[PDB]
């Protein structure tokens, strides 16, 4: 998963500008920036939901990429469990019951997994959506604010679970997220995106780093 000279604009609005990216033997890379900078855009380019990025996206298509972008995507009139089975069979290799269970109980979604998604709360949908992405047993996982709607405990358990999994599976994880405190729990580096390019590569608060870099936009 490498990005070389990626440039992307919407009409006159340049979002990405000659932006490069890689995983320097790191596993967990956080992505930090202000709203309107383009974090989702970068992720979409990597996922491959964009084909007009004027640059090179280096992906060995042999590999699977799991992801969650913006609001969760689920089939509303079906159960949570149904969605997990479907995606495992459809986007993934097949449905691995043991794997699935570890995620369900680790996240603690068990009590409502058999209920229809339309009856789920926003938080519940996100816990499920993360699991849906994980069900592909991917190597590259790309998450757009994965804990955006999670409660304090949900966030910790989900993030912890993913970190365990990156060793079980040879994964590389990109997490774009506010709540720098969550990135600080699970990370080994973070990159700060501003004005279409990376400004800092921080190897390892992130909050102080963030403000130092971005506060002057508005202030």
């Amino acid at each position: 998963m490498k990005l070389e000279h990626i440039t992307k604009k919407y009409g006159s609005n340049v979002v990405l500008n000659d932006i490069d990216f890689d995983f320097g033997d790191s596993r967990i890379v956080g992505l930090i920036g202000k709203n309107g900078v383009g974090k989702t855009t970068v992720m979409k380019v990597m996922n491959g939901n964009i084909i007009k990025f004027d640059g090179k996206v280096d992906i060995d298509n042999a590999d699977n990429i799991g992801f969650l972008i913006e609001h969760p995507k689920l089939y509303d009139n079906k159960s949570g469990l149904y969605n997990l089975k479907l995606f495992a069979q459809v986007l993934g290799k097949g449905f691995d019951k043991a794997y699935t269970d570890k995620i369900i109980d680790a996240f603690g979604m068990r009590p409502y997994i058999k209920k229809k998604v339309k009856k789920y709360s926003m938080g519940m949908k996100q816990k499920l959506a993360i699991a849906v992405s994980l069900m592909n047993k991917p190597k590259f996982l790309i998450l757009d604010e994965p804990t955006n709607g999670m409660d304090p405990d949900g966030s910790i358990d989900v993030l912890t679970t993913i970190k365990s999994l990156v060793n079980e599976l040879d994964m590389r994880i990109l997490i774009s997220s506010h709540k720098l405190e969550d990135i600080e729990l699970i990370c080994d580096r973070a990159v700060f995106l501003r004005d279409g390019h990376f400004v800092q590569d921080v190897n390892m608060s992130l909050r102080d780093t963030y403000f130092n870099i971005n506060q002057r936009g508005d202030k």
């Binding site: 007009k52 609001h71 995507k73 089939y75």
Partner: protein, 251 residues
């Protein structure tokens, strides 16, 4: 590789699986059965006070009409489900998958068409078992399958392309219905009016929308060599366009 093919088929299986679980499917089947039984019972066996002898061909055509419409709506739902739930975003991540998505849906459309044709067959067999008349040729039922496959695949792929072009679902259901019920409406309303009336009417034989819709209420069919080719050619190009388009459209 077979792994690719397997994933494509798994998506197909889920769409068909859904059809066989929703109570709506079952309701629609019962409605068709009721309507056919109703025609048979109310007048086919009584209008002219016959000795309970009926024309299966009248029943056959009516059943076809109803099933093709229901079928087309099933096809549209199959097509629009991922736009509706937004789940399409989880599929179109790379070319191999994007193409596989089109392939999967194409297969689902074909299988839906087969299902509807099987329903049609069964409803009519029950009618034949029930009353008197000369049974219809097996081969007639078979040709009816061919009609279903072509009709639904043509419209399905056409609408699919539109669905992908606009990323809207409301207008796909609308077009499905609109197109079906407009041809038989407009023909006798104004075709005869212009000095080009005959020209226009003849022209319809070379326009799949017109001739495929018109044959929905026929007791039989026989496509002319051109008409046959045009329809099939149209199916092939739509399939191709769907692939070329999905490969380039941002999601």
């Amino acid at each position: 590789v077979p792994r690719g093919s397997h994933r494509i088929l798994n998506l197909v299986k889920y769409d068909l699986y859904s059809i066989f679980k929703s109570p709506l499917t079952y309701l629609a089947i019962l409605v068709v059965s009721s309507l056919i039984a109703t025609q048979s019972i109310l007048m086919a066996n009584s209008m002219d006070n016959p000795k309970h002898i009926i024309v299966y061909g009248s029943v056959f055509a009516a059943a076809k009409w109803l099933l093709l419409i229901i079928g087309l709506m099933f096809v549209v739902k199959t097509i629009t489900r991922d736009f509706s739930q937004g789940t399409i975003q989880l599929y179109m991540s790379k070319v191999k998958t994007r193409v596989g998505y089109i392939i999967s849906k194409t297969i689902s459309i074909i299988l839906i068409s087969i299902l509807f044709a099987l329903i049609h067959y069964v409803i009519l067999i029950v009618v034949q078992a029930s009353s008197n008349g000369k049974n219809l040729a097996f081969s007639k039922y078979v040709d009816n399958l061919w009609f279903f496959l072509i009709f639904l695949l043509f419209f399905g792929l056409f609408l699919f392309l539109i669905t992908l072009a606009s990323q809207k679902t409301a207008m796909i259901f609308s077009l499905g219905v609109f197109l079906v019920l407009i041809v038989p409406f407009i023909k006798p309303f104004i075709t005869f009016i212009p000095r080009y009336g005959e020209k226009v009417l003849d022209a319809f034989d070379y326009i799949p929308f017109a001739y495929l819709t018109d044959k929905m209420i026929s007791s039989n069919f026989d496509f002319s060599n051109w008409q046959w080719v045009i329809s099939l050619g149209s199916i092939v190009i739509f399939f191709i366009l769907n692939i070329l388009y999905v490969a380039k459209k941002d999601i």
